[PDB]
Amino acid sequence: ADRWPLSYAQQRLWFLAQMGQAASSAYHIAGGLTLRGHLDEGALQAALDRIVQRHEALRTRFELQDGQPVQRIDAPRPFALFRQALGAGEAELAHWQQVEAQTPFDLGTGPLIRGRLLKRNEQEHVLLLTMHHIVSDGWSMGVLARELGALYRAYAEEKIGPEIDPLPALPLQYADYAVWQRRWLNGELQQRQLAYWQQQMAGAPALVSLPTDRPRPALQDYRGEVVDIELDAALSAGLKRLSQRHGTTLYMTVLAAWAALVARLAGQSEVVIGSPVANRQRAELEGLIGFFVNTLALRIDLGGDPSVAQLLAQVRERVLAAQSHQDLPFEQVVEALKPERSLSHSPVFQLMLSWQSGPQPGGLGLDALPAGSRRSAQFDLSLELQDRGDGTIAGSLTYASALYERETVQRHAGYLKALLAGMAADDTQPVQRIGILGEAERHRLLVEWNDTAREHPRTVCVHELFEQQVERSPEAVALVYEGQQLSYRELDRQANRLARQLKALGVGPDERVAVCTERCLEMVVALLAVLKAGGAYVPLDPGYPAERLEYMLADSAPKVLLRQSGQTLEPGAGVAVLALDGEASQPWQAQPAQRLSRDDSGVQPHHLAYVIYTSGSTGRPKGVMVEHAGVVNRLLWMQRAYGLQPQEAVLQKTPFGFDVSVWEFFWPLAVGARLVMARPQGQQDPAYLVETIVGQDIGTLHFVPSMLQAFVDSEGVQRCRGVRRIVCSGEALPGALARRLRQQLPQVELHNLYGPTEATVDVTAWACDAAELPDNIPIGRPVDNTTMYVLDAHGQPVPTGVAGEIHIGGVQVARGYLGRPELTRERFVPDPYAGRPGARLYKTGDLGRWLPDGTLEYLGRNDHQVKIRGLRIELGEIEAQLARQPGVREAVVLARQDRPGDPRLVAYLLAEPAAAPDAQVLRAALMQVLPEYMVPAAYVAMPAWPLTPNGKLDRKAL
Ligand SMILES: [Cl-]
Numbered sequence: 001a002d003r004w005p006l007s008y009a010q011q012r013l014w015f016l017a018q019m020g021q022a023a024s025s026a027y028h029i030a031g032g033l034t035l036r037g038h039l040d041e042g043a044l045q046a047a048l049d050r051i052v053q054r055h056e057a058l059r060t061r062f063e064l065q066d067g068q069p070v071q072r073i074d075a076p077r078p079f080a081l082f083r084q085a086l087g088a089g090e091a092e093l094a095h096w097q098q099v100e101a102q103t104p105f106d107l108g109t110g111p112l113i114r115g116r117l118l119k120r121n122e123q124e125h126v127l128l129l130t131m132h133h134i135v136s137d138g139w140s141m142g143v144l145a146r147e148l149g150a151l152y153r154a155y156a157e158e159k160i161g162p163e164i165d166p167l168p169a170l171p172l173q174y175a176d177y178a179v180w181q182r183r184w185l186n187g188e189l190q191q192r193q194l195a196y197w198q199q200q201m202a203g204a205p206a207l208v209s210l211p212t213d214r215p216r217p218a219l220q221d222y223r224g225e226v227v228d229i230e231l232d233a234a235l236s237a238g239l240k241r242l243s244q245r246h247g248t249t250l251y252m253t254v255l256a257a258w259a260a261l262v263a264r265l266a267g268q269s270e271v272v273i274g275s276p277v278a279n280r281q282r283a284e285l286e287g288l289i290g291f292f293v294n295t296l297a298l299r300i301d302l303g304g305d306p307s308v309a310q311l312l313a314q315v316r317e318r319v320l321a322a323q324s325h326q327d328l329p330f331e332q333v334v335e336a337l338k339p340e341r342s343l344s345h346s347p348v349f350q351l352m353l354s355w356q357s358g359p360q361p362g363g364l365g366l367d368a369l370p371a372g373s374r375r376s377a378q379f380d381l382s383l384e385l386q387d388r389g390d391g392t393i394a395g396s397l398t399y400a401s402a403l404y405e406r407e408t409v410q411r412h413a414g415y416l417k418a419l420l421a422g423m424a425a426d427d428t429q430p431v432q433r434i435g436i437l438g439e440a441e442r443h444r445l446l447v448e449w450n451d452t453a454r455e456h457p458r459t460v461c462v463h464e465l466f467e468q469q470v471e472r473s474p475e476a477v478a479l480v481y482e483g484q485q486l487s488y489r490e491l492d493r494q495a496n497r498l499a500r501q502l503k504a505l506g507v508g509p510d511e512r513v514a515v516c517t518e519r520c521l522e523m524v525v526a527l528l529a530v531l532k533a534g535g536a537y538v539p540l541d542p543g544y545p546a547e548r549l550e551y552m553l554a555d556s557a558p559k560v561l562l563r564q565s566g567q568t569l570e571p572g573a574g575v576a577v578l579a580l581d582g583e584a585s586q587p588w589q590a591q592p593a594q595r596l597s598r599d600d601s602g603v604q605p606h607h608l609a610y611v612i613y614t615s616g617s618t619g620r621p622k623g624v625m626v627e628h629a630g631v632v633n634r635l636l637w638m639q640r641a642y643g644l645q646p647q648e649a650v651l652q653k654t655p656f657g658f659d660v661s662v663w664e665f666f667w668p669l670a671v672g673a674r675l676v677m678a679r680p681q682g683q684q685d686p687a688y689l690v691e692t693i694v695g696q697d698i699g700t701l702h703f704v705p706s707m708l709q710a711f712v713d714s715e716g717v718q719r720c721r722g723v724r725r726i727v728c729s730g731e732a733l734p735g736a737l738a739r740r741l742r743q744q745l746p747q748v749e750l751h752n753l754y755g756p757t758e759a760t761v762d763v764t765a766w767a768c769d770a771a772e773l774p775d776n777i778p779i780g781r782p783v784d785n786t787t788m789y790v791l792d793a794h795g796q797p798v799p800t801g802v803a804g805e806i807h808i809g810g811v812q813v814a815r816g817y818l819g820r821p822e823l824t825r826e827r828f829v830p831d832p833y834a835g836r837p838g839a840r841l842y843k844t845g846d847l848g849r850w851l852p853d854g855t856l857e858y859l860g861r862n863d864h865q866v867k868i869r870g871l872r873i874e875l876g877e878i879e880a881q882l883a884r885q886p887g888v889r890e891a892v893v894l895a896r897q898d899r900p901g902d903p904r905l906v907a908y909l910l911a912e913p914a915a916a917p918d919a920q921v922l923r924a925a926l927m928q929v930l931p932e933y934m935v936p937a938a939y940v941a942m943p944a945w946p947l948t949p950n951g952k953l954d955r956k957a958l
């Protein structure tokens with residue numbers, strides 16, 4: 001009664017079996033062989049009987065002893081080979097090998113190895129062989145088939161007596177290996193390898209952030225499908241030559257390839273790829289049939305932007321260092337590491353790469369049988385390659401169906417094949433500069449989704465768009481400011497009168513003119529007069545402190561300051577002050593109202609139209625110099641896409657220091673509509689906006705998302721039934737706010753626009769016309785004559801769904817920053833995708849990605865990125881889940897970076913009038929919908945949001 005102990009891997013399967021969790025097909029080692037030719041059924045029986053005679057693991061039962069399990073061994077016995085028939089057909093054979101992989105074993109009585117001899121013809125059989133994983137592994141099937149083929153060829157063809165064993169005796173058995181392991185796990189060598197893996201995996205990314213077609217569920221879906229993958233002869237020989245030159249194996253070279261590709265796609269510097277390893281280092285163990293295989297986590301780093309040779313050198317050492325510590329079980333590694341085991345994904349790694357040797361290179365043709373169609377997706381992606389004897393490298397890429405689509409995985413293999421080709425071609429280049437996109441996807445990202453060319457007039461300025469409209473519609477109303485009105489002709493006369501006094505002074509092409517005034521009729525007269533005079537207008541909002549105005553006034557270095565009456569702003573010497581209204585304005589109001597000749601101004605579309613300064617969030621304000629031709633294209637597109645009618649009205653409600661006011665001014669003036677100048681900000685009642693919309697019948701309106709929220713919640717918002725369009729710019733628009741505007745005002749058409757001040761005004765637009773609106777409202781498709789690109793660190797287009805830096809190109813890119821050329825050269829780079837002489841490209845610093853439908857998605861700034869566990873976090877997904885909770889009206893989540901290198905998530909709430917929210921109610925209910933690392937630590941309530949001068953949400957005031 002000899003009772004031997006279990007190995008660590010066997011005790012885990014026994015513990016899982018007692019709980020009823022070792023019932024999967026992954027715990028059965030199934031194989032098959034097709035036997036073409038006449039079959040000596042007596043010799044095949046003698047071969048199977050000798051295998052169980054040799055390997056006492058195939059005679060092993062499992063039972064209890066003093067509470068703990070033991071490894072009982074029986075005496076040799078004949079093999080349980082079941083004979084049956086088999087009809088020809090791919091489906092009939094796939095059924096019986098599915099039964100072999102599905103049917104459970106009896107660990108108490110056995111046997112733990114079985115087979116089926118499926119007879120097809122009198123000279124063709126299919127031998128299926130299946131054994132439990134507590135007794136075998138993948139290497140064991142190779143030993144079983146190799147040992148079976150030699151025993152049959154000796155008993156059948158050589159006529160060796162079944163009495164004797166024609167193969168060499170085993171030096172030891174699996175029970176000997178278990179006794180050695182139990183003594184090893186209690187010694188210092190186990191402490192060394194556990195100490196190595198903690199240090200090696202310290203700070204590694206817990207979860208990969210590969211872009212998936214669907215979000216990953218709370219409970220992992222183990223269902224999976226497969227995508228074939230094959231490398232042709234030229235690539236395989238090039239990879240074998242590359243591996244020989246750098247001292248790596250084909251496994252190491254593919255590992256460096258996949259880890260480099262996943263780094264680009266997931267937006268992470270480090271990638272952790274799992275891999276099985278045959279724990280058969282002792283040469284005596286290579287011929288045994290036992291549970292030996294172990295898992296190794298390989299941590300690859302690409303933060304240094306390495307070359308091909310430097311990445312291969314890294315993977316070489318990290319694999320050899322991992323293989324020199326493979327004795328430690330992987331379950332003790334995941335237990336010794338910090339990250340918590342989640343039900344949504346696998347621990348430590350979510351991607352696995354595996355390699356295996358080729359087929360075995362007679363009378364009976366023992367050809368191998370391929371695996372079944374079904375594959376259990378134990379991880380997100382599983383790459384399993386082999387070196388075939390014909391000179392190619394082929395395998396299968398198994399993907400979890402709940403995460404990816406079949407089309408997405410086919411592109412993933414295409415990236416890897418193209419990446420491997422670049423590594424074999426040139427080993428000196430940086431591995432992340434290698435091209436991976438196919439010709440179809442590259443042409444779709446660069447050309448098809450940038451097909452925005454339009455033949456607009458390019459020899460016209462913004463003031464000429466107005467001069468062409470006053471001749472078509474002179475007697476129609478153009479400006480409305482508190483009862484007073486001005487026709488298109490009277491406005492053109494007032495602008496021409498002021499333009500002559502500016503032209504009498506030193507105003508000309510590219511000269512600046514500062515305009516300091518609150519909203520009135522003279523504000524639009526000043527702007528048109530500056531453009532007519534040939535210069536560019538610099539808006540100076542008097543609501544800002546005098547310190548800011550005196551800086552923008554000195555930095556712009558204008559020729560004239562157009563100042564309102566009650567304004568104490570004073571400029572420096574050299575520049576002339578000129579009154580805009582009041583008694584001090586009669587010098588220019590007495591000018592002839594005749595229009596200035598085009599050759600007198602000398603203005604051109606390539607000259608400056610305005611210089612609007614930035615808010616100064618990351619330094620002092622910068623003057624963005626925008627030319628005439630860019631504003632014309634921006635205005636002509638807005639009319640082409642929305643079609644403003646001459647009878648409609650537009651409300652000038654955005655501060656004219658905000659470049660959104662540009663189209664609020666000149667779009668209705670270039671088409672024929674009337675512009676209602678709203679009352680100045682400091683003189684407005686909370687109910688002023690609602691009564692001004694219905695009082696003046698405003699057609700087109702603009703809001704920033706945080707201001708649109710106050711408009712929806714204002715008193716009497718449903719009275720604004722005459723509104724046709726609402727445009728959103730500045731912030732990101734939540735889907736919950738868009739769906740609430742859909743109910744309050746069903747007739748209005750909401751549009752989402754994106755664009756920095758350096759790209760004229762806006763460059764992309766998206767209509768909220770879908771019946772189903774997403775939580776993340778896309779910024780849309782580019783506008784006319786402007787291209788959009790999502791580039792990586794090397795300025796190259798990233799694949800679809802991959803995050804990168806948004807780059808803007810076309811005619812709307814600004815000339816640069818006034819008086820700061822070095823910053824312009826850094827963020828106004830040449831455009832290589834245009835094919836034009838000196839076309840430029842603006843670096844926005846905004847993170848974004850292309851969606852499969854050809855639209856762009858805003859992902860925030862690069863400096864405002866939040867990461868937990870080395871994984872990017874979308875704070876909008878947390879704010880949206882808070883708003884769904886009862887008792888909460890609005891929510892904002894921020895990342896307060898304390899002393900630890902792991903920021904604290906603080907949530908800010910606007911409560912519903914019913915009651916104030918409770919922290920435990922929000923904590924528990926949100927703990928179920930979101931993971932543990934996305935639940936805020938503290939929740940605070942506020943009466944209202946603090947706002948910026950432009951109406952945006954002031955997150956720094958929170
Ligand atoms: Cl370290």
Ligand SMILES: [Cl-]
Binds near residue numbers: 197
């Ligand atoms: Cl390990």
Ligand SMILES: [Cl-]
Binds near residue numbers: 438440441
């Ligand atoms: Cl494609």
Ligand SMILES: [Cl-]
Binds near residue numbers: 756757
């Ligand atoms: Cl903006």
Ligand SMILES: [Cl-]
Binds near residue numbers: 890891892
């Ligand atoms: Cl918000």
Ligand SMILES: [Cl-]
Binds near residue numbers: 896904906
């Ligand atoms: Cl804090």
